[PDB]
Amino acid sequence: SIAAEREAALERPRRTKRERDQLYYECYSDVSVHEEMIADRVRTDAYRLGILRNWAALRGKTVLDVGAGTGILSIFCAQAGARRVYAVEASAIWQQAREVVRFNGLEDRVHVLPGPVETVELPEQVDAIVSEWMGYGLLHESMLSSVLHARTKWLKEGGLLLPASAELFIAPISDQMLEWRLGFWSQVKQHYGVDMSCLEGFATRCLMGHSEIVVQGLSGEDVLARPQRFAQLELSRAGLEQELEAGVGGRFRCSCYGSAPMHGFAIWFQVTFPGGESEKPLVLSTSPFHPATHWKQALLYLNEPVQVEQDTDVSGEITLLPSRDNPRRLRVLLRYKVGDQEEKTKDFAMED
Amino acid sequence: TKRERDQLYYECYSDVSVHEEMIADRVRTDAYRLGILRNWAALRGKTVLDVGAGTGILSIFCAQAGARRVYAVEASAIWQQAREVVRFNGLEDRVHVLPGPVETVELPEQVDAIVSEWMGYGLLHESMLSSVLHARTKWLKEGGLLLPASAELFIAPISDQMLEWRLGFWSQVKQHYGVDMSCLEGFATRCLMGHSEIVVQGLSGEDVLARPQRFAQLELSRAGLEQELEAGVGGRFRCSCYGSAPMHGFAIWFQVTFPGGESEKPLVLSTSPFHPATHWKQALLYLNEPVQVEQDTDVSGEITLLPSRDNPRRLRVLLRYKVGDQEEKTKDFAMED
Ligand SMILES: Nc1ncnc2c1ncn2[C@@H]1O[C@H](CSCC[C@H](N)C(=O)O)[C@@H](O)[C@H]1O
Ligand SMILES: Nc1ncnc2c1ncn2[C@@H]1O[C@H](CSCC[C@H](N)C(=O)O)[C@@H](O)[C@H]1O
Ligand SMILES: CN(CCN)Cc1cn[nH]c1-c1ccc(F)cc1
Ligand SMILES: CN(CCN)Cc1cn[nH]c1-c1ccc(F)cc1
Numbered sequence A: 001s002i003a004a005e006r007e008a009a010l011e012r013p014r015r016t017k018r019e020r021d022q023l024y025y026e027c028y029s030d031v032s033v034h035e036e037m038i039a040d041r042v043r044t045d046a047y048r049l050g051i052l053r054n055w056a057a058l059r060g061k062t063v064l065d066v067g068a069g070t071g072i073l074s075i076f077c078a079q080a081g082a083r084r085v086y087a088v089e090a091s092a093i094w095q096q097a098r099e100v101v102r103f104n105g106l107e108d109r110v111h112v113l114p115g116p117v118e119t120v121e122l123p124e125q126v127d128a129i130v131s132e133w134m135g136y137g138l139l140h141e142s143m144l145s146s147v148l149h150a151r152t153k154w155l156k157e158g159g160l161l162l163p164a165s166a167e168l169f170i171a172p173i174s175d176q177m178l179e180w181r182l183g184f185w186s187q188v189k190q191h192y193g194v195d196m197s198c199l200e201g202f203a204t205r206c207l208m209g210h211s212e213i214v215v216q217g218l219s220g221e222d223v224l225a226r227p228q229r230f231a232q233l234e235l236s237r238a239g240l241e242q243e244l245e246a247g248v249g250g251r252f253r254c255s256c257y258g259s260a261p262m263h264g265f266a267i268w269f270q271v272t273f274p275g276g277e278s279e280k281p282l283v284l285s286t287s288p289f290h291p292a293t294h295w296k297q298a299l300l301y302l303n304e305p306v307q308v309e310q311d312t313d314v315s316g317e318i319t320l321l322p323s324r325d326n327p328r329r330l331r332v333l334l335r336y337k338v339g340d341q342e343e344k345t346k347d348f349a350m351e352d
Numbered sequence B: 001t002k003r004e005r006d007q008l009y010y011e012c013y014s015d016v017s018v019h020e021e022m023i024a025d026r027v028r029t030d031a032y033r034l035g036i037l038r039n040w041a042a043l044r045g046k047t048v049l050d051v052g053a054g055t056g057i058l059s060i061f062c063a064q065a066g067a068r069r070v071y072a073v074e075a076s077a078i079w080q081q082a083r084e085v086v087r088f089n090g091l092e093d094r095v096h097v098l099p100g101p102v103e104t105v106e107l108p109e110q111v112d113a114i115v116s117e118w119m120g121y122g123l124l125h126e127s128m129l130s131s132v133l134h135a136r137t138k139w140l141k142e143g144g145l146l147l148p149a150s151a152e153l154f155i156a157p158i159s160d161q162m163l164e165w166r167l168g169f170w171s172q173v174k175q176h177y178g179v180d181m182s183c184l185e186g187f188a189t190r191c192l193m194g195h196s197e198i199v200v201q202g203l204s205g206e207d208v209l210a211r212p213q214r215f216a217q218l219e220l221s222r223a224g225l226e227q228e229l230e231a232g233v234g235g236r237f238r239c240s241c242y243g244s245a246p247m248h249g250f251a252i253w254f255q256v257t258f259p260g261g262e263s264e265k266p267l268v269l270s271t272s273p274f275h276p277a278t279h280w281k282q283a284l285l286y287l288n289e290p291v292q293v294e295q296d297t298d299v300s301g302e303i304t305l306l307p308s309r310d311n312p313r314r315l316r317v318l319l320r321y322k323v324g325d326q327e328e329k330t331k332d333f334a335m336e337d
Helices: A002-026 A031-039 A041-052 A072-080 A094-103 A144-154 A176-192 A197-208 A240-246 B002-013 B016-024 B026-037 B057-064 B079-088 B129-139 B161-177 B182-192 B225-231
Strands: A062-066 A084-089 A110-114 A126-130 A155-162 A165-173 A212-216 A228-234 A248-255 A260-273 A282-285 A297-308 A313-322 A330-338 A344-350 B047-051 B069-074 B095-099 B111-115 B140-147 B150-158 B197-201 B213-219 B233-240 B245-258 B267-270 B282-293 B298-307 B315-323 B329-335
Touching (some): A031 A041, A031 B161, A041 A072, A041 A260, A041 B161, A062 A072, A062 A144, A072 A084, A072 A094, A072 A110, A072 A126, A084 A094, A094 A110, A094 B182, A126 A144, A144 A155, A165 A248, A165 A313, A176 A197, A176 B016, A197 A297, A197 B016, A197 B079, A212 A344, A240 A313, A260 A313, A260 A330, A297 A330, B002 B016, B026 B057, B026 B140, B026 B245, B026 B267, B047 B057, B047 B129, B057 B069, B057 B095, B057 B111, B069 B079, B079 B095, B111 B129, B129 B225, B150 B298, B161 B182, B197 B329, B213 B233, B225 B298, B245 B298, B245 B315, B282 B315, B282 B329
Parallel strands (some): A062 A084, B047 B069, B047 B111
Antiparallel strands (some): A165 A228, A212 A297, A228 A248, A248 A313, A260 A282, A260 A297, A313 A330, A330 A344, B150 B213, B197 B282, B233 B298, B245 B267, B245 B282, B315 B329
């Protein structure tokens, strides 16, 4: 009755969250998002090889695949020699995953289970967990909590986690697409005979003055200083679920290579698969120096461009967290200082 | 309500992106450029109304063509940028920028010519043509010039090779990953073809399966044209296919025509897949799933373009069609978000 009233107090927020989660899972009910993920060969091959590389530890064992999607990774586990895979999926796509499993003659080895991993009922604890949970800037979507919840509740003592860790990186960058778009108004006179160079200011406010994280792929030569690691996440680390709510990040400092128009920062990530005593640990990287992936990079624009020079000092602080309104939307708090300019603040939220 | 439909519409035109896109659209901007300049004899010393002047570029084309006065009317916040561009080009006493919707603007005089780039996806998306016709009736002098003067709509059955590759993707998964996912073709089809949305995507001429059929001609000088827009524009079509293909649906596109001047050759701005690409691309009307056609497969039906009930600016397409001897089918579309 006091107990009853306490439940009645949490009923409203618990329902809002259920409704929110349901909108998020729907983001994965359509073909395109899976098409994109499986066409991403770097992503998909890193998982396949990461799994394969651990066939010795997986032979005859059991696996939980958190967010099975179309079932692909679960099937990788089955092919690696796993006795049993529980393919858990909260989005309507679990139906396609079930179809793929049956079509591949694997319905005895892979069990597709609908609904959230947080409330799924497995018949036993598992020897390994596999999950592709990473969002833009690693933490967009906030799926990691789900994976950690599954670990604490269902992974056997000393069990395997694929992947096992993640690292976050930041570098000052120059966006060539952005530069072209800002410069476009100065080109109008030469194409059509009307001087529109006075709109550069306006173009800059629209395209750089907003507070959204932008997903764009850059290449090596857009990076204006040595990339700095700013966070390391060891997935097995006790109560890391709390660290997430409070923010993950760190401070950074670096020195620019040379003359360049600086537009802001790129952040990206990598995840590491533990290796068997075969081949060693396999890194899946989303770096602009490395083969492109569907995550690209997450771009954080300064309000306007800043010219940097060789040995220009760039430092600051970055923290990744949930947005106030949408816990599944990535927020980035950026503190930064370029050259002799004063320290500045920008508070970004993931592009819809 | 209605107030909030317009905030969202004009907010998009308040921002740089759509203007960069229209202006980087070379086929579009150079058609207006040449179209305007070749009507110098109609424009020199005359007065012009630019309906929806945006950044003011076409108004400036008009002034460069000799107009003594241009009224550049713009309902979004971008009117500030247009006034700046006008000042910067020393054109403030030739071009006057006026904020607000053309429906309620007051000009100091009736005009000799109207210019406007009012066309949306599938021609009528955004429903801006009302505004131009409203301005013609209220402000254009008897016998005045309209740039462009007319519009035409076209339809053709299509096989969209890019879509075909997206449907066939699932059959290629085994080759590279060792998992057979070819059983997901059905699901891919329902996702990419089974919805009711008009898709703005660019096609190749090689995607066109039959001779394109004109299904509407819009003569802008015609009183009464206003009232038809509400009934719907369109009518029947029929054509016969070139060869074997999986037909995915139909593409529609449009052209607009600027009268020739003294030089006397009309300039046509086309959005056909047989012509250089524009930012309008083509508007795609996918059937629920592919249908196999052969050479001389007859394709017929009826198409209506009209505004949605709940949102007057959102294009709606009502399609009725018959492929070969297959039974007649029906499908309703609304413009993509
Ligand atoms: N709490 C939760 N429980 C179960 N599934 C979840 C979840 N949160 C997210 N998901 C699912 O996890 C998937 C992540 S992406 C798809 C990964 C898929 N295994 C692949 O590699 O292709 C989505 O399908 C999403 O619906
Ligand atoms: N009823 C109305 N009154 C005034 N402007 C309008 C309008 N409906 C749409 N517009 C404006 O008309 C423009 C259409 S597109 C911009 C065209 C610009 N003349 C160019 O060719 O680059 C937009 O700027 C839009 O805000
Ligand atoms: C980011 N990847 C990998 C998720 N593990 C999913 C994806 C691929 N394309 N688009 C998405 C996506 C993007 C944003 C979402 F909220 C959900 C999915
Ligand atoms: C469709 N064109 C030309 C309109 N005269 C404007 C444009 C360019 N990019 N995107 C748009 C656009 C698209 C949809 C809208 F509701 C408004 C503008």
